[PDB]
Amino acid sequence: DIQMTQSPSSLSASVGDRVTITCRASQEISGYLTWLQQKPGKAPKLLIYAASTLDSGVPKRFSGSRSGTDFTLTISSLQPEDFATYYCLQYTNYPLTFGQGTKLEIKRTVAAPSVFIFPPSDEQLKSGTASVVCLLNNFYPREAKVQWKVDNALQSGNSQESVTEQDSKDSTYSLSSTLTLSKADYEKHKVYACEVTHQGLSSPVTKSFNR
Amino acid sequence: APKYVKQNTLKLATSGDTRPRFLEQVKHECHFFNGTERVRFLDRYFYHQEEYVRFDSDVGEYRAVTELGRPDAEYWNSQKDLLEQKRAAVDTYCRHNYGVGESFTVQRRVYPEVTVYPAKNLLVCSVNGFYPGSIEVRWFRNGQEEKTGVVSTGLIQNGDWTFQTLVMLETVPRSGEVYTCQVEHPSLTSPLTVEWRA
Amino acid sequence: EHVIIQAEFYLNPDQSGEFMFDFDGDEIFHVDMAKKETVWRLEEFGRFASFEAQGALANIAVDKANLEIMTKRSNYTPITNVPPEVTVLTNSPVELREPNVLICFIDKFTPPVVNVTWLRNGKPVTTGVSETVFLPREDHLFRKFHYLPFLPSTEDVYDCRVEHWGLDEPLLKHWEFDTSGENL
Amino acid sequence: QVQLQESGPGLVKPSETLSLTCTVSGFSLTSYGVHWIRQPPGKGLEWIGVIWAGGSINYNSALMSRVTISKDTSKNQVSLKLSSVTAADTAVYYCARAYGDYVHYAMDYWGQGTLVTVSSASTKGPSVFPLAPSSKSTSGGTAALGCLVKDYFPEPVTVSWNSGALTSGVHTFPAVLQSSGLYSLSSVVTVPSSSLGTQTYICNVNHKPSNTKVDKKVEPKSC
Ligand SMILES: *[C@@H]1O[C@H](CO)[C@@H](O)[C@H](O)[C@H]1NC(C)=O
Ligand SMILES: *[C@@H]1O[C@H](CO)[C@@H](O)[C@H](O)[C@H]1NC(C)=O
């Protein structure tokens, strides 16, 4: 019933930068705002309450204030482990409403992906299915083009990808593209390859095997 | 007559019931390590519950914690004469006021009073009225230290320069098992022991 | 290992100021605004040390001026009424007709204005009641202590009534001789 | 050790009742109240309700008829029931802590959260296949080996390496919902190339929603 507008929706900044997330309230929340940090796969962690009171166990580099009618979370010197989604929360009146959230990511130097291709196993093949796995190791930025070429012919609609969240120490990502076929359609071909296009690669990298 | 000295609050830089409330706090903090060996002065200024400017003696200048202190710090670091007193405060203010008061604050010892009573199974070792807060309580079940079933209330400040704590033991006493609670405190020259006498 | 803080605050529009000294969480002394003199938390401390209160009051005037400048620089942004935590404690383990102290401990609050009343069987006790000053915390909120010396009774029930602007009603924390342990 | 820990079924059929319990430790439910907050995957957070220390219960207006939150102070647990669950009620559910009996007391120390998936499908254990190292998955002085955890329902599976002895270089990927409806993920680890042959690598996959415990020994391949 009370509206919390969080801005910007996503953010990328370098290590040592000063970042600033703003949160607008539709009504007056009488200072009752909480800033929460959620790392992926974890609960929200209480950073700031009462718009500027720091919770015990939160580092000094986080600070909360009010820019006019808007509210402000400020990280003074950004650290690599601060990659998280930050939420603002009012607690002045039922119902308690959260913001949309700001995804804070870390900028770093561009890193080329290491490409590894895994042929399908014997146990899966005797179960009647074939999964070829193409793994992209620690790389930045997150945008990567993974194409599947079977007998030099581009496949489409038979591969699914999954990207890890940013690593807390070197600020990289990793990708897993899985190509899945039936045993008959797998055994209809000989050469299986995954081609990787990335900003850290001058030319596309093709890893291949022969069935 | 031992005399406490004050640290002067600095003048800032110019830019009934349901009414707004406005609060400004100033904390001149002296932090001591190894007695009077390692001393850190920390002149901190707060608006409401938020810090806006701070002098750290490990930094040596007034720095702004939020944007609101930026006019002050540049003003305060524009007067080097003020900064020399702020840097010399480690010796002239922190160590002086440590000196006039070390007898009754640092070397203050109060005997703890220890009581063992059963509650609503559960045994309670209530240790009340001691200073300083460095206390150590152990539960010896039949001459064996229990590490499984001990919950402590933690250090609880009473405000009389006295602390208290209630260390609990969740066990299963059945027939005449002797339980012992031990208290270790700097006011004691030897450890203090009390037996439940089942 | 040891921390000594000279704690000062000023609050408008109550025009209430405070100068005090802290050693490791406990008050050494408090300069009283009225009567213009130091009040040592323990009376023995005044026979071991001394302090001139008038310069402390000058610092409180400087705090007033700094609060004017910060109020103008904050576009009249109000403080947040952070509600208080109230726990009723006993100084000793209670036995019947064995003299003890009921301690109302108030914690984690700002602004430092609170209305505290002891209630013996629902009746206010306005005499023979002690209190400490607003002791500062390191999250820059406040704590306060209230004391009622008493003699424990089977039938008597006591109540701490704490009134703060962060609450919609006065908070009432109960204590009776039976069920004196609520600490997990 | 202030802890709050959610517990529940994980998979509920539609129009049934979801029943969750938050077991707490380190504090008292007679001095503290607890909040229920749910988070759909990918989307934001949503406050379900509170049960205060004094027994006061407050629900949200959107789910007022369907939410019942109760409290057993003796067993230090708090129960949340949702009647007539839909697919929008599939979320990670969190219990958090606040002091006293008033909304202006801040919410401290969230719990880890339990995942509730509302679906009419049955559970299924996962098949684990080795992603064997080879010349294709060895770039100079480093090699990669993994485990493919495939065809399970519902989330989650947990993959460790050498019972937690191997943590550096471990990359467990988010699960992808296949067109067939089951989930599948992979967990890889990069090791030095010389270490292959002289070090045993076993991935440990645990899917308690299907009561499945699989240890798979990944062994080197040729091609
Ligand atoms: C502490 O101070 C004493 C003298 O007061 C000194 O000898 C010692 O080196 C200092 N440091 C430690 C770690 O004890
Ligand atoms: C205390 O009571 C007075 C009236 O007696 C009232 O004006 C004031 O607001 C109260 N203080 C609070 C609610 O903090």
Residue numbers in the entry:
A (entry chain D): 1 to 211
B (entry chain B): 2 to 16, 28 to 132, 140 to 217
C (entry chain A): 4 to 187
D (entry chain C): 1 to 82, 82A, 82B, 82C, 83 to 100, 100A, 100B, 100C, ...
Please give sentences taken from the publication describing this entry.
Here, we describe the humanization of the pan-HLA-DR mAb 44H10, a murine antibody displaying significant involvement of the framework region in antigen binding. Murine mAb 44H10 was shown to target an epitope on the HLA-DR molecule conserved in humans, suggesting its potential clinical benefit across populations irrespective of HLA haplotype. Using a structure-guided approach, we identify and restore framework residues that directly interact with the antigen or indirectly modulate antigen binding by shaping the antibody paratope and engineer a humanized antibody with affinity, biophysical profile, and molecular binding basis comparable to that of the parental 44H10 mAb. Here, we describe the structure-guided humanization of mAb 44H10, leveraging CDR grafting methodologies further guided by critical insights derived from the structural characterization of both the parental antibody and intermediate humanized candidates.
The IgG format of this new lead candidate, named V22, displayed improved binding relative to all previous versions in both BLI and flow cytometry binding assays, with a less than two-fold reduction in EC50 relative to parental 44H10 IgG measured by flow cytometry. To compare the molecular basis of the HLA-DR reactivity of our lead humanized candidate to that of the parental 44H10 antibody, the crystal structure of the V22 Fab-HLA-DR complex was solved to a 3.1 Å resolution. As expected, V22 targeted the same epitope on HLA-DR as parental 44H10, with similar BSA contributions to the antigen interface for both antibodies. Furthermore, key interactions mediated by the antibody CDRs were highly conserved between the parental and humanized Fabs. In the HCDR3, H-Y100B and H-Y96 mediated hydrogen bonds with the main chains of P87 and V89 in the HLA-DR α chain, respectively, as seen in the parental 44H10 Fab-HLA-DR crystal structure. In the LCDR1, L-Y32 formed a hydrogen bond with the main chain of α-N84. Finally, key hydrogen bonds were formed by L-Y49, L-S52 and L-T53 in the antibody LCDR2, contacting HLA-DR residues β-Q63, β-E64 and α-D142. Due to weak electron density surrounding the L-K60 side chain in this co-crystal condition, we unfortunately could not observe contacts mediated by this key FW residue in the V22-HLA-DR crystal structure. Furthermore, ion coordination by the LFR3 loop in the V22 structure, which was not observed in the parental structure solved from a different co-crystallization condition, did not permit the direct comparison of contacts mediated by L-R66. Nonetheless, the structural elucidation of the V22 Fab-HLA-DR complex demonstrates that the humanized 44H10 antibody, V22, targets HLA-DR in a binding mode comparable to that of parental 44H10.
